[PDB]
Design a protein around this nucleic acid. Sequence first.
DNA 1: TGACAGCACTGAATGTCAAAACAAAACCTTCACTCGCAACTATAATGGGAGCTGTCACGGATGCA
Length: 114
Amino acid sequence: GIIRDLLIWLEGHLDQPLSLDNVAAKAGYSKWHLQRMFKDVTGHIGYIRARRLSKSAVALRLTARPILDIALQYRFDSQQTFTRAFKKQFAQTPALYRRSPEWSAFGIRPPLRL
DNA sequence: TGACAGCACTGAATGTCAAAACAAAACCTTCACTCGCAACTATAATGGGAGCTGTCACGGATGCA
């Protein structure tokens, strides 16, 4: 029942509030108990990383800002830490992703509309 | 049985050298067209002015005289 409210706030707050699990522990419950409370609902929450990589991927293709704002806008640690997450997930360079004139759904994790 | 607390373990990823790479093209040679300096030519013709001035005028100065 209760932690429905985490789902689309996370659609809205992968932004300027740097939310970690202890910042996600501000949703009422503990660090370890929110995990399995999210697990049997969804199957897959720390999804957040995907939204961070999905949520950064609105900035590559659909806004004209270059790459250095992107690795620090949507709450990743660094430009290699971004591309470490990028290459584990999308298996590309984002300089080889946005510059390419074609773009399809290989690595971009969907948001949970459960 | 009830909901919910916070530890246990697992794996993925984060931080690690590395050369694989592509482009800032800036740093070098090219090859040249052109822009640049240097030399000659052999009826024969032999003193500059040069368009300007426009009359200030004393006390002073020296130079001669």
